CSV table of C-alpha atoms in Angstrom, one decimal:
chain,number,residue,atom,x,y,z
A,1,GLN,CA,-19.0,-19.1,9.4
A,2,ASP,CA,-16.3,-16.3,9.0
A,3,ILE,CA,-18.2,-13.4,7.4
A,4,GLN,CA,-17.2,-12.6,3.8
A,5,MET,CA,-17.2,-9.1,2.4
A,6,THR,CA,-18.2,-8.2,-1.2
A,7,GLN,CA,-17.9,-4.9,-2.9
A,8,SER,CA,-19.3,-3.5,-6.2
A,9,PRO,CA,-18.2,-2.6,-8.6
A,10,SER,CA,-14.5,-3.8,-8.3
A,11,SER,CA,-13.5,-0.6,-10.2
A,12,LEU,CA,-15.0,2.5,-11.7
A,13,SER,CA,-13.8,5.5,-13.6
A,14,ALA,CA,-15.5,8.8,-12.9
A,15,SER,CA,-15.0,12.4,-13.6
A,16,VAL,CA,-13.7,15.1,-11.2
A,17,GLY,CA,-16.8,16.7,-9.6
A,18,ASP,CA,-18.9,13.5,-10.1
A,19,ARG,CA,-20.8,11.6,-7.3
A,20,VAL,CA,-19.3,8.2,-6.7
A,21,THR,CA,-21.2,5.4,-5.0
A,22,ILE,CA,-19.4,2.2,-3.7
A,23,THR,CA,-21.4,-0.7,-2.3
A,24,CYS,CA,-20.2,-3.2,0.3
A,25,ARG,CA,-22.2,-6.3,1.5
A,26,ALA,CA,-21.7,-8.8,4.4
A,27,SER,CA,-22.6,-12.5,4.0
A,28,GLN,CA,-24.0,-12.4,7.5
A,29,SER,CA,-25.3,-9.6,9.7
A,30,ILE,CA,-22.8,-7.2,11.0
A,31,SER,CA,-25.2,-4.6,12.5
A,32,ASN,CA,-23.9,-1.1,11.6
A,33,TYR,CA,-20.2,-2.1,12.2
A,34,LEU,CA,-18.8,-1.3,8.8
A,35,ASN,CA,-15.7,0.8,8.1
A,36,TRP,CA,-14.2,2.4,4.9
A,37,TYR,CA,-10.5,2.7,4.1
A,38,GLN,CA,-8.8,4.5,1.4
A,39,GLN,CA,-5.7,2.9,0.1
A,40,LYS,CA,-3.3,4.5,-2.4
A,41,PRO,CA,-0.8,2.2,-4.1
A,42,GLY,CA,1.9,0.8,-1.9
A,43,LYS,CA,0.6,2.8,1.1
A,44,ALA,CA,-0.9,2.2,4.5
A,45,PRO,CA,-4.7,2.3,4.4
A,46,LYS,CA,-6.4,5.4,5.7
A,47,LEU,CA,-9.6,5.0,7.8
A,48,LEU,CA,-12.4,7.2,6.4
A,49,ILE,CA,-15.6,6.0,8.0
A,50,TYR,CA,-16.5,3.7,10.9
A,51,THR,CA,-19.9,2.4,12.1
A,52,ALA,CA,-21.3,2.8,8.5
A,53,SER,CA,-21.6,6.6,8.6
A,54,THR,CA,-19.2,8.1,11.2
A,55,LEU,CA,-16.6,10.2,9.4
A,56,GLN,CA,-13.1,9.9,11.0
A,57,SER,CA,-11.5,13.3,11.9
A,58,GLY,CA,-9.4,15.1,9.1
A,59,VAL,CA,-11.5,13.3,6.5
A,60,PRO,CA,-13.1,15.7,3.9
A,61,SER,CA,-16.9,16.1,4.3
A,62,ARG,CA,-17.3,14.9,0.6
A,63,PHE,CA,-16.9,11.3,1.9
A,64,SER,CA,-20.0,9.9,3.5
A,65,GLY,CA,-21.2,6.3,4.4
A,66,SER,CA,-24.6,4.8,4.6
A,67,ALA,CA,-26.3,1.6,5.6
A,68,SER,CA,-28.6,0.8,2.7
A,69,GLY,CA,-30.9,-1.9,4.0
A,70,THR,CA,-28.5,-4.8,4.4
A,71,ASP,CA,-25.9,-3.1,2.1
A,72,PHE,CA,-23.5,-0.3,2.9
A,73,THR,CA,-22.4,2.5,0.6
A,74,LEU,CA,-19.6,4.9,0.5
A,75,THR,CA,-20.4,8.1,-1.3
A,76,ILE,CA,-17.7,10.5,-2.7
A,77,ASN,CA,-19.5,13.7,-3.5
A,78,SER,CA,-17.5,15.9,-5.9
A,79,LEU,CA,-14.8,13.4,-6.9
A,80,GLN,CA,-11.4,15.0,-6.7
A,81,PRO,CA,-8.1,14.1,-8.5
A,82,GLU,CA,-6.5,13.0,-5.1
A,83,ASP,CA,-9.3,10.5,-4.6
A,84,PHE,CA,-7.7,8.1,-6.9
A,85,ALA,CA,-7.4,5.1,-4.8
A,86,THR,CA,-8.7,1.6,-3.8
A,87,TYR,CA,-11.7,1.9,-1.4
A,88,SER,CA,-12.1,-1.0,1.0
A,89,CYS,CA,-14.8,-1.9,3.5
A,90,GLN,CA,-14.2,-3.8,6.7
A,91,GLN,CA,-16.8,-5.5,9.0
A,92,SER,CA,-16.2,-4.5,12.6
A,93,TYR,CA,-18.7,-6.9,14.2
A,94,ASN,CA,-16.4,-10.0,14.9
A,95,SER,CA,-13.4,-12.0,14.3
A,96,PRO,CA,-11.8,-11.9,11.8
A,97,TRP,CA,-12.6,-8.1,11.3
A,98,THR,CA,-12.8,-9.0,7.6
A,99,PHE,CA,-11.8,-6.6,4.9
A,100,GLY,CA,-13.4,-6.5,1.5
A,101,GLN,CA,-11.1,-6.8,-1.6
A,102,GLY,CA,-11.5,-3.1,-2.6
A,103,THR,CA,-13.0,-1.0,-5.3
A,104,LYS,CA,-10.5,0.7,-7.6
A,105,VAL,CA,-11.5,4.3,-8.3
A,106,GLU,CA,-9.9,5.8,-11.4
A,107,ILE,CA,-10.3,9.6,-12.3
A,108,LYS,CA,-11.5,10.1,-15.8
A,109,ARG,CA,-9.8,13.2,-16.9
A,110,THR,CA,-9.5,14.6,-20.4
A,111,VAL,CA,-7.4,13.1,-23.2
A,112,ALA,CA,-3.7,14.1,-23.0
A,113,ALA,CA,-0.7,13.5,-25.3
A,114,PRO,CA,2.4,11.9,-24.0
A,115,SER,CA,5.9,13.5,-24.4
A,116,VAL,CA,8.2,10.9,-25.6
A,117,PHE,CA,11.9,10.6,-24.5
A,118,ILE,CA,14.5,7.9,-25.4
A,119,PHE,CA,17.6,6.9,-23.4
A,120,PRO,CA,20.5,4.8,-24.7
A,121,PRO,CA,22.4,2.4,-22.5
A,122,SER,CA,25.1,3.9,-20.3
A,123,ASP,CA,28.8,3.1,-20.8
A,124,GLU,CA,28.7,1.7,-17.4
A,125,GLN,CA,26.0,-0.9,-18.3
A,126,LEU,CA,27.6,-1.7,-21.7
A,127,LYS,CA,30.9,-2.6,-19.8
A,128,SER,CA,28.9,-5.5,-18.1
A,129,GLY,CA,27.6,-7.1,-21.3
A,130,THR,CA,24.0,-6.0,-21.5
A,131,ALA,CA,22.3,-3.1,-23.1
A,132,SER,CA,18.9,-1.5,-22.0
A,133,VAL,CA,17.4,1.2,-24.0
A,134,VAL,CA,14.5,3.0,-22.3
A,135,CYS,CA,11.7,4.9,-23.8
A,136,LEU,CA,9.6,7.1,-21.6
A,137,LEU,CA,5.9,8.2,-22.3
A,138,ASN,CA,5.3,11.0,-19.9
A,139,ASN,CA,2.0,12.4,-18.4
A,140,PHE,CA,-0.7,11.0,-20.8
A,141,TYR,CA,-4.3,10.0,-20.6
A,142,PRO,CA,-6.0,7.5,-21.1
A,143,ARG,CA,-3.7,4.6,-20.0
A,144,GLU,CA,-3.7,2.8,-23.4
A,145,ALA,CA,-0.7,3.4,-25.6
A,146,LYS,CA,1.1,1.5,-28.3
A,147,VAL,CA,4.9,1.3,-28.1
A,148,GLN,CA,7.0,-0.2,-30.9
A,149,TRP,CA,10.7,-0.7,-31.1
A,150,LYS,CA,12.7,-0.6,-34.2
A,151,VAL,CA,16.4,-1.4,-34.7
A,152,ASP,CA,17.7,-0.4,-38.1
A,153,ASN,CA,14.0,-0.2,-39.0
A,154,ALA,CA,13.3,-3.8,-38.1
A,155,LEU,CA,10.5,-4.1,-35.7
A,156,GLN,CA,11.4,-5.7,-32.4
A,157,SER,CA,9.3,-8.4,-30.9
A,158,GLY,CA,9.5,-10.2,-27.5
A,159,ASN,CA,12.6,-8.3,-26.2
A,160,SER,CA,11.0,-5.4,-24.3
A,161,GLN,CA,8.9,-4.9,-21.2
A,162,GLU,CA,6.6,-2.2,-20.1
A,163,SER,CA,5.8,-0.4,-16.8
A,164,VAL,CA,3.1,2.2,-16.1
A,165,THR,CA,2.9,4.5,-13.0
A,166,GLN,CA,-0.3,4.7,-11.1
A,167,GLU,CA,-2.5,7.7,-11.9
A,168,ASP,CA,-1.0,11.0,-10.7
A,169,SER,CA,-2.9,12.4,-7.7
A,170,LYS,CA,-2.8,16.0,-9.2
A,171,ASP,CA,-3.1,15.8,-13.0
A,172,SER,CA,-4.6,12.3,-13.2
A,173,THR,CA,-2.1,11.2,-15.9
A,174,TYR,CA,0.0,8.1,-16.4
A,175,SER,CA,3.6,7.7,-17.4
A,176,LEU,CA,4.9,4.6,-19.0
A,177,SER,CA,8.4,3.1,-19.6
A,178,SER,CA,9.3,0.6,-22.3
A,179,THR,CA,12.7,-1.0,-21.9
A,180,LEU,CA,14.3,-2.9,-24.7
A,181,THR,CA,17.0,-5.4,-23.6
A,182,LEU,CA,19.8,-6.5,-25.9
A,183,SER,CA,23.2,-8.2,-25.4
A,184,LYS,CA,26.1,-5.9,-25.8
A,185,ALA,CA,27.0,-7.9,-28.9
A,186,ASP,CA,23.5,-7.4,-30.5
A,187,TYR,CA,23.5,-3.8,-29.5
A,188,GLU,CA,26.8,-3.1,-31.2
A,189,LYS,CA,25.6,-4.7,-34.4
A,190,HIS,CA,23.1,-1.9,-35.1
A,191,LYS,CA,23.0,1.9,-35.4
A,192,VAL,CA,19.4,3.3,-35.2
A,193,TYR,CA,17.3,2.8,-32.1
A,194,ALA,CA,13.8,4.1,-32.4
A,195,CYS,CA,10.7,4.1,-30.0
A,196,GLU,CA,7.4,4.7,-31.9
A,197,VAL,CA,4.4,5.7,-29.8
A,198,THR,CA,0.8,5.6,-30.9
A,199,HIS,CA,-1.8,7.2,-28.6
A,200,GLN,CA,-5.2,8.7,-28.6
A,201,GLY,CA,-3.9,12.2,-27.8
A,202,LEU,CA,-1.4,12.3,-30.8
A,203,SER,CA,-2.6,13.2,-34.3
A,204,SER,CA,0.1,10.8,-35.7
A,205,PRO,CA,2.6,8.4,-34.1
A,206,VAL,CA,5.6,9.9,-32.4
A,207,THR,CA,9.2,8.5,-33.0
A,208,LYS,CA,12.1,9.2,-30.8
A,209,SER,CA,15.4,7.9,-31.7
A,210,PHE,CA,19.1,7.9,-31.6
A,211,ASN,CA,22.2,6.6,-33.4
A,212,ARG,CA,24.5,4.4,-31.4
A,213,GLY,CA,27.6,6.6,-30.7
A,214,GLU,CA,26.1,10.1,-31.4
B,1,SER,CA,-18.1,-19.2,20.6
B,2,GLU,CA,-17.3,-18.3,24.2
B,3,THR,CA,-15.7,-14.8,23.4
B,4,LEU,CA,-17.1,-11.5,22.2
B,5,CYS,CA,-15.3,-8.7,20.4
B,6,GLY,CA,-16.1,-5.6,18.4
B,7,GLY,CA,-19.6,-4.6,17.5
B,8,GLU,CA,-21.1,-8.0,18.5
B,9,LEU,CA,-19.8,-7.3,22.0
B,10,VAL,CA,-21.3,-3.7,21.9
B,11,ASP,CA,-24.6,-5.0,20.6
B,12,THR,CA,-24.7,-7.8,23.3
B,13,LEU,CA,-23.9,-5.3,26.1
B,14,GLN,CA,-26.6,-2.9,25.0
B,15,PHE,CA,-29.1,-5.7,25.0
B,16,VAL,CA,-27.9,-7.1,28.2
B,17,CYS,CA,-27.9,-3.8,30.1
B,18,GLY,CA,-31.4,-2.7,28.9
B,19,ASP,CA,-32.5,0.7,30.1
B,20,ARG,CA,-29.9,0.9,32.7
B,21,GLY,CA,-27.0,1.4,30.3
B,22,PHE,CA,-23.3,0.8,30.6
B,23,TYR,CA,-21.6,1.3,34.0
B,24,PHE,CA,-19.0,2.8,31.9
B,25,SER,CA,-21.4,5.5,30.9
B,26,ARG,CA,-19.3,8.3,29.4
B,27,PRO,CA,-16.8,8.5,26.6
B,28,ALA,CA,-14.1,9.0,29.3
B,29,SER,CA,-15.2,5.9,31.3
B,30,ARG,CA,-15.3,3.7,28.2
B,31,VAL,CA,-11.6,4.4,27.6
B,32,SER,CA,-10.9,3.5,31.2
B,33,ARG,CA,-8.6,0.7,32.4
B,34,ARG,CA,-11.4,-0.9,34.3
B,35,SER,CA,-13.7,-1.0,31.2
B,36,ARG,CA,-10.8,-2.4,29.0
B,37,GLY,CA,-10.1,-5.0,31.7
B,38,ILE,CA,-13.6,-6.5,31.3
B,39,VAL,CA,-13.6,-6.1,27.5
B,40,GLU,CA,-10.2,-7.6,27.0
B,41,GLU,CA,-11.3,-10.7,29.0
B,42,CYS,CA,-14.5,-11.1,27.0
B,43,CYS,CA,-12.8,-10.7,23.7
B,44,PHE,CA,-9.4,-12.5,24.2
B,45,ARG,CA,-10.5,-15.1,26.8
B,46,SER,CA,-14.0,-16.0,27.8
B,47,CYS,CA,-17.2,-14.0,28.2
B,48,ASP,CA,-20.2,-15.0,30.0
B,49,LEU,CA,-23.5,-13.4,31.1
B,50,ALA,CA,-22.1,-12.8,34.6
B,51,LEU,CA,-19.0,-11.0,33.2
B,52,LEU,CA,-21.2,-9.1,30.8
B,53,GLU,CA,-23.6,-8.0,33.6
B,54,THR,CA,-20.7,-6.5,35.6
B,55,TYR,CA,-20.4,-4.0,32.6
B,56,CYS,CA,-24.0,-2.6,33.4
B,57,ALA,CA,-25.1,0.3,35.5
B,58,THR,CA,-26.8,-0.4,38.8
B,59,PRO,CA,-29.5,2.2,39.5
B,60,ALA,CA,-32.1,2.0,42.2
C,1,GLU,CA,2.3,13.7,14.8
C,2,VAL,CA,1.2,10.3,16.0
C,3,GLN,CA,3.4,7.6,14.3
C,4,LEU,CA,3.8,3.9,14.0
C,5,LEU,CA,7.2,3.2,12.4
C,6,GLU,CA,7.8,-0.4,11.4
C,7,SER,CA,11.2,-2.1,10.8
C,8,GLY,CA,12.4,-5.7,10.5
C,9,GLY,CA,10.9,-7.0,7.2
C,10,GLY,CA,12.9,-8.8,4.6
C,11,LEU,CA,13.9,-12.1,2.9
C,12,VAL,CA,13.8,-15.4,4.8
C,13,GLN,CA,13.9,-19.0,3.7
C,14,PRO,CA,10.8,-21.3,4.2
C,15,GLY,CA,10.9,-22.7,7.7
C,16,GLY,CA,12.8,-19.5,8.8
C,17,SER,CA,12.1,-16.9,11.4
C,18,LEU,CA,11.7,-13.0,11.3
C,19,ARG,CA,10.8,-10.4,13.9
C,20,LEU,CA,8.9,-7.2,13.1
C,21,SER,CA,8.9,-4.1,15.3
C,22,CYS,CA,6.5,-1.2,15.3
C,23,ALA,CA,7.7,1.8,17.3
C,24,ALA,CA,5.0,4.1,18.5
C,25,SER,CA,5.4,7.8,19.0
C,26,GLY,CA,3.0,10.9,19.8
C,27,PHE,CA,0.5,8.9,21.9
C,28,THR,CA,0.0,7.0,25.1
C,29,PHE,CA,0.9,3.6,23.6
C,30,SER,CA,-0.2,1.6,26.8
C,31,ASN,CA,-4.0,2.8,26.4
C,32,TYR,CA,-4.2,1.0,23.1
C,33,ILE,CA,-5.0,-2.4,21.8
C,34,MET,CA,-2.6,-3.1,18.9
C,35,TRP,CA,-3.1,-5.0,15.7
C,36,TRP,CA,-1.0,-6.8,12.9
C,37,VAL,CA,-2.6,-6.8,9.5
C,38,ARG,CA,-1.1,-8.2,6.3
C,39,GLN,CA,-1.5,-7.7,2.6
C,40,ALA,CA,-0.4,-10.5,0.3
C,41,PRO,CA,0.4,-9.6,-3.4
C,42,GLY,CA,-2.9,-8.8,-5.2
C,43,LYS,CA,-5.0,-9.8,-2.2
C,44,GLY,CA,-7.0,-7.9,0.4
C,45,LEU,CA,-5.9,-6.9,3.9
C,46,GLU,CA,-6.2,-9.6,6.5
C,47,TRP,CA,-6.0,-9.6,10.3
C,48,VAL,CA,-2.9,-11.4,11.6
C,49,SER,CA,-2.8,-10.7,15.3
C,50,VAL,CA,-4.1,-8.6,18.1
C,51,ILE,CA,-2.8,-7.9,21.7
C,52,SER,CA,-4.5,-6.2,24.6
C,53,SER,CA,-3.1,-2.9,25.9
C,54,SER,CA,-1.1,-4.4,28.9
C,55,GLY,CA,0.1,-7.2,26.6
C,56,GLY,CA,-1.1,-10.0,28.8
C,57,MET,CA,-3.7,-11.4,26.3
C,58,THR,CA,-3.4,-12.0,22.5
C,59,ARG,CA,-5.4,-13.5,19.6
C,60,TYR,CA,-4.3,-14.9,16.2
C,61,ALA,CA,-5.8,-15.7,12.8
C,62,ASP,CA,-6.0,-19.4,12.3
C,63,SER,CA,-3.5,-19.3,9.4
C,64,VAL,CA,-0.8,-18.2,11.8
C,65,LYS,CA,-1.5,-19.8,15.2
C,66,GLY,CA,1.3,-21.7,16.8
C,67,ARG,CA,3.7,-20.0,14.5
C,68,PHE,CA,3.6,-16.2,15.2
C,69,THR,CA,3.8,-14.4,18.5
C,70,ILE,CA,2.7,-10.8,19.1
C,71,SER,CA,4.0,-8.9,22.1
C,72,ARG,CA,4.7,-5.4,23.2
C,73,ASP,CA,7.0,-3.6,25.5
C,74,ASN,CA,5.1,-0.7,26.9
C,75,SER,CA,8.3,0.8,28.4
C,76,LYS,CA,9.9,1.3,25.0
C,77,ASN,CA,6.6,2.1,23.2
C,78,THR,CA,7.0,-0.8,20.8
C,79,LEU,CA,5.0,-3.7,19.3
C,80,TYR,CA,6.5,-7.0,18.0
C,81,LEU,CA,5.5,-9.8,15.7
C,82,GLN,CA,7.7,-12.9,16.0
C,83,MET,CA,7.1,-15.0,12.8
C,84,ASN,CA,8.4,-18.6,12.9
C,85,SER,CA,8.1,-21.6,10.6
C,86,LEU,CA,7.6,-19.0,7.8
C,87,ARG,CA,5.7,-20.4,4.7
C,88,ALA,CA,5.7,-18.9,1.2
C,89,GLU,CA,2.0,-17.9,1.7
C,90,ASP,CA,3.2,-15.5,4.5
C,91,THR,CA,4.8,-13.4,1.9
C,92,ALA,CA,3.0,-10.0,2.1
C,93,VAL,CA,3.3,-6.4,3.4
C,94,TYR,CA,2.8,-6.4,7.2
C,95,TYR,CA,1.1,-3.4,8.9
C,96,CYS,CA,0.7,-2.6,12.4
C,97,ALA,CA,-2.3,-0.6,13.4
C,98,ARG,CA,-3.9,1.1,16.5
C,99,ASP,CA,-7.4,0.4,17.7
C,100,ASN,CA,-9.7,3.2,17.0
C,101,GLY,CA,-12.4,2.1,19.6
C,102,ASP,CA,-13.1,0.6,23.0
C,103,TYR,CA,-14.5,-2.9,22.4
C,104,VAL,CA,-11.6,-4.4,20.3
C,105,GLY,CA,-11.9,-3.5,16.7
C,106,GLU,CA,-15.4,-2.1,16.7
C,107,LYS,CA,-14.5,1.3,15.1
C,108,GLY,CA,-11.6,0.1,12.7
C,109,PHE,CA,-8.0,0.8,13.1
C,110,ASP,CA,-7.2,4.5,12.8
C,111,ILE,CA,-3.4,4.7,12.9
C,112,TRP,CA,-1.2,2.5,10.7
C,113,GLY,CA,2.5,1.7,10.3
C,114,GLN,CA,3.9,2.4,6.8
C,115,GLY,CA,4.1,-1.4,6.1
C,116,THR,CA,7.1,-3.7,6.0
C,117,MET,CA,7.5,-6.3,3.3
C,118,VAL,CA,8.2,-10.0,4.2
C,119,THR,CA,9.4,-12.4,1.4
C,120,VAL,CA,9.6,-16.1,2.1
C,121,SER,CA,11.7,-17.7,-0.6
C,122,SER,CA,14.7,-20.0,-1.3
C,123,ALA,CA,16.3,-17.4,-3.6
C,124,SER,CA,19.3,-15.3,-2.4
C,125,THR,CA,19.2,-11.6,-2.1
C,126,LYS,CA,20.8,-9.6,-4.9
C,127,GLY,CA,21.6,-5.9,-4.7
C,128,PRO,CA,20.9,-3.7,-7.8
C,129,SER,CA,23.1,-2.2,-10.4
C,130,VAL,CA,22.2,1.5,-10.9
C,131,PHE,CA,22.7,3.1,-14.3
C,132,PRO,CA,22.2,6.6,-15.5
C,133,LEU,CA,19.5,7.5,-17.9
C,134,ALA,CA,21.4,10.6,-19.2
C,135,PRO,CA,19.5,13.6,-20.6
C,136,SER,CA,20.2,14.9,-24.1
C,137,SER,CA,18.8,16.9,-27.0
C,138,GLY,CA,12.1,23.8,-22.4
C,139,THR,CA,12.1,20.5,-20.5
C,140,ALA,CA,14.5,17.6,-20.2
C,141,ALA,CA,14.1,14.1,-18.8
C,142,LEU,CA,16.7,12.1,-16.9
C,143,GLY,CA,16.6,9.0,-14.8
C,144,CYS,CA,18.3,6.0,-13.1
C,145,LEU,CA,17.8,2.5,-14.1
C,146,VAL,CA,17.9,0.2,-11.2
C,147,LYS,CA,18.5,-3.3,-12.5
C,148,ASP,CA,18.7,-6.9,-11.4
C,149,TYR,CA,17.8,-7.0,-7.7
C,150,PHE,CA,15.8,-9.3,-5.4
C,151,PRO,CA,13.6,-9.3,-3.5
C,152,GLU,CA,11.5,-6.2,-3.8
C,153,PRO,CA,11.6,-3.2,-2.9
C,154,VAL,CA,14.1,-0.5,-3.6
C,155,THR,CA,13.7,3.1,-2.5
C,156,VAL,CA,14.5,5.8,-5.1
C,157,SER,CA,14.9,9.5,-4.2
C,158,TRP,CA,16.4,12.4,-6.1
C,159,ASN,CA,18.8,14.9,-4.4
C,160,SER,CA,18.3,13.3,-0.9
C,161,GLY,CA,14.5,14.0,-1.1
C,162,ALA,CA,15.2,17.7,-2.0
C,163,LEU,CA,13.7,17.0,-5.5
C,164,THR,CA,10.1,15.5,-5.6
C,165,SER,CA,8.1,17.1,-8.4
C,166,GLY,CA,8.2,15.6,-11.8
C,167,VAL,CA,9.6,12.4,-10.4
C,168,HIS,CA,8.2,9.0,-11.7
C,169,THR,CA,9.6,5.9,-10.1
C,170,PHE,CA,8.1,3.0,-12.0
C,171,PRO,CA,6.8,-0.1,-10.4
C,172,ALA,CA,9.3,-2.9,-10.6
C,173,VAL,CA,9.0,-5.6,-13.4
C,174,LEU,CA,10.0,-9.2,-13.0
C,175,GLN,CA,12.5,-10.1,-15.7
C,176,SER,CA,12.7,-13.7,-17.2
C,177,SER,CA,15.8,-14.1,-14.9
C,178,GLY,CA,13.7,-13.8,-11.7
C,179,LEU,CA,15.4,-10.5,-10.9
C,180,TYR,CA,13.6,-7.1,-10.7
C,181,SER,CA,14.2,-3.9,-12.6
C,182,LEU,CA,12.9,-0.4,-12.4
C,183,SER,CA,13.5,3.1,-13.7
C,184,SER,CA,13.0,6.4,-11.9
C,185,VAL,CA,12.7,9.4,-14.1
C,186,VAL,CA,12.5,13.0,-13.5
C,187,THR,CA,11.6,16.0,-15.8
C,188,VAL,CA,13.6,19.2,-15.1
C,189,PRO,CA,14.2,22.5,-16.9
C,190,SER,CA,16.9,22.3,-19.6
C,191,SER,CA,18.2,25.6,-18.3
C,192,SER,CA,19.4,24.2,-15.0
C,193,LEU,CA,21.1,21.1,-16.5
C,194,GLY,CA,24.8,22.2,-16.1
C,195,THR,CA,23.8,24.7,-13.3
C,196,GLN,CA,22.7,21.9,-11.0
C,197,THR,CA,23.6,18.3,-10.0
C,198,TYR,CA,21.0,15.5,-10.3
C,199,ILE,CA,21.7,12.5,-8.1
C,200,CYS,CA,19.4,9.5,-7.5
C,201,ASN,CA,19.5,7.7,-4.1
C,202,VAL,CA,18.8,3.9,-4.4
C,203,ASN,CA,18.3,2.0,-1.3
C,204,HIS,CA,17.9,-1.8,-1.3
C,205,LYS,CA,17.8,-3.0,2.2
C,206,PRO,CA,17.4,-6.7,1.8
C,207,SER,CA,21.0,-6.6,0.5
C,208,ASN,CA,22.4,-3.4,2.2
C,209,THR,CA,23.0,-1.6,-1.0
C,210,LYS,CA,22.9,2.1,-0.9
C,211,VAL,CA,24.0,3.9,-4.1
C,212,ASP,CA,24.0,7.5,-5.1
C,213,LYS,CA,24.3,7.8,-8.9
C,214,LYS,CA,25.2,11.3,-10.3
C,215,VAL,CA,23.2,11.8,-13.6
C,216,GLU,CA,25.0,14.3,-15.9
C,217,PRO,CA,24.3,15.1,-19.5
C,218,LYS,CA,25.6,13.0,-22.3
């Protein structure tokens, strides 16, 4: 009995200047009462469209909505780099004013190489009995990247964790961190700390490294 | 149910008030306290055809 | 500038109680039907509660009935959500939102609060340790590592908000410990790297930590 909302596809990747088409369906009849929201990561949604096709003020004309039989579609004409977002529909017919789960729109930009940087653990952190060594891969595309740790040339396994920013709203790239965690004891045992990056935009893998102390 | 909210409310009113239209007939009157008074009752409390009919215009 | 500014989120044990506030500015608050909407981790937005413009009538999602109370004080231009008997499944970002239409929700919600996180958990809050990611040997990178805090979130800014471009604050990762960690990095010109100070401002409100860490070369 509560109306369920279904979107397709759950995500897509499309190029700047492309026409993007997102579908929303209701499991019961909602008349023309369907809204579209744009939600950027960790942000309040922004209303784009209400009553299927009425553009909210301050919203660019490239966004349009349509009833499509018993379907609804949001159209982004001329996809822009800022448009990276989750787009969610919401029926406005009755309680519980149900939102769909969203369609992730990624911007398919051109291949771009990461810049690689390595950071040894601070003296402050070492004092407290742990060592975190951070490798940054900055401003790359696509998302996929291989990041390997070496300690005195021995490959590390199971002792690092990765984090990736959401696509940048200007240049459509990603940055990634890999953080290798060691006890102060283990960190003091070894000399050469190296982060090796393999990426599509690099002709050969990039190693950034330091010697403990230098 | 016994309440009406959102577009189902709007669609029900349009059908109820036929060619007469809404009493609250202009954007400015749909934002009015009196309009909201009727709408808040239908949605939050109970809505019946009599309440709905009070929302319609009354031409001769 | 129309604005809904929320406050009041944080960590609370199961069975506990929290009160959110949403302070409105730049519009006639009393003309508007107001909404609470929540977003649980990796879930969609969902209606929590709605209140009429005077405040005298209210409506709740089934999942929260008997436990939450919405209210408003038109005199102070503020909306409240009183959350009692808090359950783990109530953990989410909580938004307030203004009604865009005239028939209660028929044209969506136009104006939204920034969101406030609510974490329902037995675990104690823990403030972060903040460590430099010192630049060394055109463009140089520096950072702060923000390690071992709970619950989410932390705020990170550079130079009190004076420095924004080239900043990358990574999403937080859950360590095997159950604690969160995050880095915020910035790329800056190597030229101004003895010329100017770089300072990261880390705010963790669930534990009242506020740290400025000065990041200098090394």
